[PDB]
Amino acid sequence: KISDLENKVTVSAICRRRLPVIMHRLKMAETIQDAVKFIEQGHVRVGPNLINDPAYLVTRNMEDYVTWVDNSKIKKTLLRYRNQIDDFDFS
């Protein structure tokens, strides 16, 4: 799309790159109301480094690697409910 960037890129798309709504579309949380609680508690990394500010825009080439850190309570209880908690690599 070349000249019709006048009409589509709006608030509902430029906020769709946000880490809470990308988290909710990745189904890592129930809703935004506790997705912001998780990524403010500092459980969620993207790439290699942890990210804490809940206004971050995950880019195109980083949406694939926005995953929970090792050694965290939510990763531990996820692997516990799936009952696959391979406890060699910390969790």
């Binding site: 990745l26 890592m28 506790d34 929970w68 996820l78 409910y81």
Partner: peptide, 19 residues
Amino acid sequence: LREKAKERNPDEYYHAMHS
């Protein structure tokens, strides 16, 4: 349901998965 299994997204979490 086979398509959702092939896209399972292995990092989903809710409050209901504690027991």
